[PDB]
Amino acid sequence: AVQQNKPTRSKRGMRRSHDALTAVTSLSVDKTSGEKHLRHHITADGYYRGRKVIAK
Amino acid sequence: MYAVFQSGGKQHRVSEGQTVRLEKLDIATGETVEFAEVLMIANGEEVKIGVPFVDGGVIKAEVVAHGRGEKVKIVKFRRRKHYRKQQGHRQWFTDVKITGISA
Amino acid sequence: MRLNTLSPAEGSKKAGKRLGRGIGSGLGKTGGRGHKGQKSRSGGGVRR
Amino acid sequence: METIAKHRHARSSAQKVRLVADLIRGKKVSQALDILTYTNKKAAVLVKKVLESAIANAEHNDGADIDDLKVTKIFVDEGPSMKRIMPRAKGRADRILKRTSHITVVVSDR
Amino acid sequence: ARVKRGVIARARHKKILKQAKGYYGARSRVYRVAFQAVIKAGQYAYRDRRQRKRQFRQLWIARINAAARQNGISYSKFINGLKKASVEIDRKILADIAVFDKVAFTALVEKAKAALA
């Protein structure tokens, strides 16, 4: 549409409060190694349930 | 002990050891302030008196400061009519400190 | 030196209105000319 | 001991960065550094490289230790805009503005 | 003689936005809303000098009333007796002994109550 007036800067901040980037709740490590993870996906070494993935 | 005296047409409460303010006196710092215009000293109870300015009472004081306050502002204004005017005032006073008052 | 101790003759100085400056000033809007009509506006039309 | 890393001319509008800056105020470097690892977004790697630079000069030089580091300040200010003309209705030749941000990370042990 | 125009207004401004500290949003930072806000302020401010006193003066009557009804007399009968009774200037601002240390004020209400006819 348009607007009435130029709005206050507290409004602009309430309007963004739910759209803000949300916490990850910590991280994963392997249940069976000291290799770092990406949670419930497969690492660069194929590690989750062994085999091999992502040979870049 | 608390007591009441008249600054003028207004009546004022004050205690012992109290520094209190009123409108400016002629009486200076190196002089004595004293009030015979005491309306009661409220003793242990309400007193039942008719004739005020109790003859068996005084509030002795002294001046402790003569100054001026902060600047207060007065705006007189009427809209769409192009009417705006301003005045200031700081107002004089005297501080007195109360030593007197019998129980 | 005795210069810069001078002053205008007794009562000679009016100073006179500057106009068009502030709104708590007394002078401001219209100029001392009032609302609308030929004499409130800039100089034109009619002879004396 | 305090360190500034800046990146000027970085490829971002400033609102998308201010969403993240206000999240990590007072957060300490390690918790934010995880939060950005488990944010996949390209923006979150963009801030990581400057956040990582902030940590690295603390790990050397004038800093000493980087566990007790905390992100004391985090802010972004208006970079140089490049101007392009947007095709639009009835041949309106209106401006679209291509933003950069001058993004500042400050870390200290304080 | 080129005059600069406005280096005086920079101080008049700073005097208004300083007087408009504590005001909300644009009021503490925009001269235009600051000035309005300032002018309105001093009207209430001079108004409320008198108006507080007329307002408190209601509270004074209502604490004397409560004292009086406990002594089974109404406030208007209690003034109308004290008039009839000899002297006392009195004052409505007097009865702190309404609110606190309520053991007192009785002697004064009881004189006025007696003196009524």
Next chain:
Amino acid sequence: VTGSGKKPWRQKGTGRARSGSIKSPIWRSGGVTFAARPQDHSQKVNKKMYRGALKSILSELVRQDRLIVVEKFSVEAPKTKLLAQKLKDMALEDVLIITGELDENLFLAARNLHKVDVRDATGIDPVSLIAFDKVVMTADAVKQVEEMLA
């Protein structure tokens, strides 16, 4: 403003300035509404007011003991170091020198001296005469000023 009469225009009554001409003073820059005109502020000067104001300052020069009247003041030459060593000996500093005779040998002097200056008594300059610490004078100038106020 020359070099263009263009109308920026694009009508009036459409959410913008009346936009009459590109040279009107309020159009940001290039020439302003009341810019300065040549001033030359000199008058007639009224002879009878002038000479009687000079009688007031002239009277004030004896009452403050400022009229020195050095007798037949001159130097051999217009050299600043010979006049200055005279003035230092006579113990005078920062003086209005009045020549009675407009003689070139005093009149072309004093330039090297910071606060010292020479004029002649013929139509004496009244804004000078009310400034400076002292008036040097000769007895020849004093005769011709009483006769100029006559």
Next chain:
Amino acid sequence: MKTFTAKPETVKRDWYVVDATGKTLGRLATELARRLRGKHKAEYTPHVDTGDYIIVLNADKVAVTGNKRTDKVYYHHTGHIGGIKQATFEEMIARRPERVIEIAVKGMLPKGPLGRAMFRKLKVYAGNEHNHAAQQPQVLDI
């Protein structure tokens, strides 16, 4: 300087149980509203609700006196359907039996917010089953 005056930290309240069982709706009501503001006691403050914590012992059987009963039908328009809306006088006593006294003292409190701050001290319950037994309530006669 100014005379001293009362402050929010001092307010006593105390607990009162008011027998209403001999009484009438509006002379109960306007007394009730006076105590509930704190205008029965010395306020000496224009902005602190002083007042009592008020237990009504019953008030479920309170006669209004006269025919105003059968025309007190509580008009409201919450957001639906043609007609003005109402509730009988009988609803106010058969269901939420307090409600005849409640939206009678309600209208005696000021505007929106302050009148909510005054109100939160009154309770009536269903009637004659009251639960401030342990506080030992001060009885009060009208």
Next chain:
RNA sequence: CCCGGCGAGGGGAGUGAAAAAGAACCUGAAACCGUGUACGUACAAGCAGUGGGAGCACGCUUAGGCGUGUGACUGCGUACC
């Protein structure tokens, strides 16, 4: 010398009187966005101001009921041209 792709940007080390002169460098507002502290926002409402004010930090309160800043709460109250 540190970080990053050979990048951009900043810091350290070292220069100068000064970099709170770091290359767009003169001292530098206001709009501008953000940090840090205090204290506030979940019985909670309108020109956001005025009057009354718990509470709380700082000021040896010279404790003499105050100053400063904020302020639950609430009586009253309709911007300028």
Next chain:
RNA sequence: GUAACGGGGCUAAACCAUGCACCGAAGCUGCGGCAGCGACGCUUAUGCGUUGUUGGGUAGGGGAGCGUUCUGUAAGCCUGCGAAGGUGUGCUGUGAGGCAUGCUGGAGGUAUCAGAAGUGCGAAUGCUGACAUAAGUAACGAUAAAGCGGGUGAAAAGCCC
């Protein structure tokens, strides 16, 4: 949507006959400050003492003051022994304003008083700049679509192969 006392409430807390009281405005008045000016006294170039009606005010007239740019005393004199300029606060005046002061600053500044003027923006649906706003809103330009393997590369659904 009660909504014809303003409402709650009052079938007497109503209303009517008589009569008394209270509250209730910068009104009536007292305290303390003050403006201008009549009378009277001192007795003036300048005022102060007593007494007094007085002081809501636009359009509009008139009087007074300020600062900004500039001259003149200022060819003097103060200056890195910390100038102008910025800025937060305290003080002070009826107000405009002025003054003090920590911060900041690395060269400049000054009255009294008279005199000249491009002489204070917030409005002209005013002109220009820096830069805020609605907004994390809308956009993906004939859907001549694409895949997945490898590679330059630091990184690829779109590139190169």
